[PDB]
Amino acid sequence: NNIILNLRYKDNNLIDLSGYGAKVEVYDGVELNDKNQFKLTSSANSKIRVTQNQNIIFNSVFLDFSVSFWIRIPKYKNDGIQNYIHNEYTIINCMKNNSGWKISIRGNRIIWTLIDINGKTKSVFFEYNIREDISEYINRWFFVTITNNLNNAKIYINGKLESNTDIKDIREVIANGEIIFKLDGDIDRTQFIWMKYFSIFNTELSQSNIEERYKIQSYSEYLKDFWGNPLMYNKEYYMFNAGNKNSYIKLKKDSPVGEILTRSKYNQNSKYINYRDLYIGEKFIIRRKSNSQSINDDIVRKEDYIYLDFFNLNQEWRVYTYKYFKKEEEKLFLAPISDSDEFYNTIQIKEYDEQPTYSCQLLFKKDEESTDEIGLIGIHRFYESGWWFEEYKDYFCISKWYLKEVKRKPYNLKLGCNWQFIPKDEGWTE
Amino acid sequence: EDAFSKLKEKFMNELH
Ligand SMILES: CC(=O)N[C@H]1[C@H](O[C@@H]2[C@H](O[C@]3(C(=O)O)C[C@H](O)[C@@H](NC(C)=O)[C@H]([C@H](O)[C@H](O)CO)O3)[C@@H](O)[C@H](O[C@H]3[C@H](O)[C@@H](O)[C@H](O)O[C@@H]3CO)O[C@@H]2CO)O[C@H](CO)[C@H](O)[C@@H]1O[C@@H]1O[C@H](CO)[C@H](O)[C@H](O[C@]2(C(=O)O)C[C@H](O)[C@@H](NC(C)=O)[C@H]([C@H](O)[C@H](O)CO)O2)[C@H]1O
């Protein structure tokens, strides 16, 4: 409600479904999908022009409005950190007679600029850290909302207030110009931005309305990968533990188990950046257990029954749990595909969290029918060796312990039963 | 073959 522009995918196109029937021109250089995602590149013809309807009556000038959208901003090039930090570029422009708003990016900053008839210019921005071992923001879908009052220009991220500027010094802003979606500034030939669900409202939205909107635009039947795109069957993925962020799974040498190693890090000499490597450890692949069920698309849904496979020695291997583990946690068995009575191979994929998340849980069961729970896949510190000094070592494991900890509310984000799946993505190079 | 049987044996060695 109060919505005055609402860009949505429809028949190989973007259209205003606000109910005010704006004209939208998508040029040949914009990539679209039925997931409502669209891509702006460096190309001259990667642009969208939106003309607001001029046969219906709207405000000539206005300073009580809001802009909502999701964005996915690719990681800096390691050898391009100078240009990234310094070179500001517009992504969305709405200016008639040298006044109105624009959205722009300078490296790890997203910037909201107002300009009045007089030419007074005020900005509010949101900067994310590019020294984090694992960023919540770099190359990942997140939710932006910018509200405007007479007093305050606010930026909310994933439903939470983050930045505030005083804009009482600005009285008059023209908000009825053409909205041009286009990368405009000294960008690299390879620069691009993904956006979805771009909306404009004729009101300043409450924090409550922004958080309800974050939760609804986040909800799906289907699970999501590390980047925030839909999780897929038959797709190569690396595995991230949300509970042990700097951990990764590797097949132990001459042993059919998964040892947990520490992620390698950014090794070059830039003082401005640091990250943990993401494209390390075993390459996993998700398979549907059943083909007799209806499987029109390759999208992984909550409560689906899967096999969890990985590649070893140019062969597809599988993750099993031993059937008879008396202990509270056991090392998983990583071995070729095999009908063996001594091991379970069936996983149900769960979402125990009720807040928006990209994490999922992996529940071993007897059969698709059996109603009893064996344990959740996680990580555990096991006794390795020593009598005087005791060596302990992390292994890829199952645990009954997790079954009780997933029931506690608010959901414990720190549990090692919380996994994300990371495919190779052009927006992350290391 | 029983290459899988040699891994099941190594797995049993691994978890005590
Ligand atoms: C710390 C520990 O050893 N925990 C293991 C637990 O150990 C038992 C005793 O400790 C507690 C406890 O967990 O704190 C004591 C509490 O008082 C109990 N809870 C309550 C309500 O009071 C709790 C209960 O077990 C649970 O409530 C339910 O059962 O147990 C511990 O003191 C004792 O110590 C041993 C010791 O080994 C001996 O050397 C010594 O002689 O004394 C005793 C005798 O052996 O052992 C107790 C068990 O016998 O036991 C449970 C099994 O019930 C687990 O093994 C638990 O360890 C957890 O195992 C799970 C897998 O099952 C994971 O491996 C957990 O590690 C990770 C993970 O989730 O993957 C690693 C993550 O990095 C970490 N998150 C981080 C760091 O970000 C998460 C973890 O979820 C978060 O840290 C918490 O939010 O843990 C691992 O902790």
Numbering used by the authors:
A (entry chain A): 862 to 1291
B (entry chain S): 37 to 52
What does the paper say about this structure?
Botulinum neurotoxins (BoNTs) are a family of protein toxins produced by various clostridial bacteria. BoNTs target motor nerve terminals by binding to specific receptors and enter neurons via receptor-mediated endocytosis. Besides gangliosides, BoNT/B, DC, and G utilize the synaptic vesicle membrane proteins synaptotagmin (Syt) I and II as their protein receptors, whereas BoNT/A, E, and D utilize synaptic vesicle protein 2 (SV2), another family of synaptic vesicle membrane proteins. When BoNT/B was modeled onto cell membranes via anchoring by gangliosides and Syt I/II, an extended loop between its GBS and Syt-binding site was recognized to be at a location ideal for membrane interactions.
We next examined the effect of replacing the tip residues I and V with aromatic ones, including I1248W (designated HC/BW) and a double mutation (I1248W/V1249W, designated HC/BWW). Crystals were successfully obtained for HC/BWW in the presence of the GD1a oligosaccharide and a peptide corresponding to human Syt I (residues 33–53, hSyt I). The structure was solved to a 2.4-Å resolution. The overall structure of HC/BWW is virtually identical to that of WT HC/B. The interactions of HC/BWW with GD1a and hSyt I also match the previously solved structure of HC/B in complex with GD1a and rat Syt II peptides. Recognition of GD1a is based on a stacking interaction between W1262 and the central galactose-4 moiety of the carbohydrate, with the surrounding pocket (including E1190, H1241, S1260, Y1263, and E1273) offering multiple hydrogen bonds to the adjacent N-acetylglucosamine (GalNAc3) and sialic acid group (Sia5). On the other side of the LBL, the Syt peptide occupies the binding crevice and mostly involves hydrophobic interactions. The LBL was clearly defined in the HC/BWW structure and is located between the GBS and Syt-binding site. The loop protrudes significantly, with the side chains of W1248 and W1249 exposed toward the surface at the tip of LBL in HC/BWW. The ternary complex of HC/BWW with both gangliosides and Syt I peptide demonstrates conclusively that introducing two consecutive tryptophan residues does not alter the conformation of HC/B or affect the GBS and Syt-binding site.
